[PDB]
Each structure stands twice: as C-alpha cells, then as structure tokens.
Amino acid sequence: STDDLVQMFPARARRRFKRGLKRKPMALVKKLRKAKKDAPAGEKPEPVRTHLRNMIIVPEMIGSLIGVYNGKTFNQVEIKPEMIGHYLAEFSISYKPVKH
C-alpha cells in the first residue's frame, strides 16, 4: 500500500516516488526479502552491501543489514522504525570529523 505511505512521507520523499523509481532500487529491494529468507529462524540476516546512497528507506526495509558505500568502505547499516523517510546516504559518513 505505497499510496498512503507517500502521504506520510515528506515532500521530497513523495516527489521521488512520483518520478517512478528506476531499475536499480527495484533490484535492491528484492535482496532484502531474499536475505530475510536466507536468515536462520530469528537470526541476524546476511549483509546486503549496496552502492546506492540515494535510495529512500521504506517500511519494508526495516530489518535488513545494508552496507551503504561511502566512497571507500562498504559501511554496514541497521534499520530502525525511525529510519523511515531518509536516504541510505545519511548513514555512511563520507568524510572524517576533524581534529586539529
């Protein structure tokens, strides 16, 4: 039921959907289900290591172990119910905090 979710989502998020998410996010979404099936009964599922950082987290995603690439490392991420509405970008820092 994506349609009532886009109403919950903020304006950037629903505009993103209204443009028709292309092939790569559709190839990524399947692998979360696939990992959940592979995962032993009530166990930590396989890491899903992704290149995409502009995909938005949809309520299906909660439970996946994604490895959002930050340019150099495949930094693994875990999803919580509050992680809804952001991208996988803001969870893999691309830089390092500065200490002079």
């Binding site: 919580k80 509050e82 992680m83 952001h86 970008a89 803001e90 969870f91 905090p97």
Partner: protein, 136 residues
C-alpha cells in the same frame, strides 16, 4: 488612566510586558511571532490600538483560548509551526516551553539515529550545508 494598569502579565510563563501594545507584547511568548500574534489579536476580536495592560482579563482568557486551540478558530493548516507531526501526526501550535522541549526531542531522535544532521548537531558544526573554512 488605566487604574488597574498592569506592567507584568505572566501569560503562559513568559512575563509579558504591560507597557507595550498587545500585538507586540504577546510576541514575548516563545512560539508566537508577529504574524501569529496578529492572528490571535484578530480572532479574539481585540482592539489592536490597545496597550497590553489596559486590557480586560476576559479578553485574555480568549487570547489563550485561540492560542491553545489554533485549529478550532479556523486558523488554517499552513499557519501552524508543527505541520504534520512525526511523533503523532497532528497540526499543532507549540508554545513557550514545549518549543524547546520538542526541539531537543528532535535532535535526540537524530542523535540516536546516527543521522548526518544528528552528528552535525552533536559535533557543534554547522548542519545546513554552509561552508566552514572561514565562518564561525
């Protein structure tokens, strides 16, 4: 001659001046700007060319009635500062102390998330994309 003329008003824990005009006295509350104070002064039907302090209290009770129920006096959806809440989902008008309360609940959310903006808040760095070679 305002014989009961008040100089302090303590409306909503904000210590309103009794020495100023209403639409700029009620802006002292954290959550009401000049625009919202104007809308309050209109819907409660108050002479705006009145110093806050020359007021009658029955007027004041209506002021609080409109500010605590902004949705009820037909104040439109876009006017409020809590459009489409994320904790609940309501269109509210957060007021003096709940502004800080809610704000720190948001930044706490982003902190527990490991959000980019949460970490920018925690580090004390700028959070909105501005440059920082030479600013700060």
């Amino acid at each position: 001659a305002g014989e009961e003329f008040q100089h302090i008003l303590r409306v909503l824990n904000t210590n309103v001046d009794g020495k100023q005009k209403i639409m700029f006295a009620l802006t002292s509350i954290k959550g009401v700007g000049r625009r919202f104070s104007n809308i309050v002064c209109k819907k409660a039907d108050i002479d705006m060319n009145k110093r806050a302090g020359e007021l009658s209290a029955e007027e004041m009770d209506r002021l609080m009635a409109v500010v605590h129920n902004p949705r009820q006096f037909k104040v439109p959806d876009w006017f409020l500062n809590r459009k489409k809440d994320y904790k609940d989902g309501r269109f509210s008008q957060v007021v003096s102390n709940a502004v800080d309360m809610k704000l720190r609940d948001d930044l706490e959310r982003l902190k527990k998330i490991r959000n980019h903006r949460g970490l920018r808040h925690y580090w004390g760095v700028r959070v909105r994309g501005q440059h920082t070679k030479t600013t700060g």
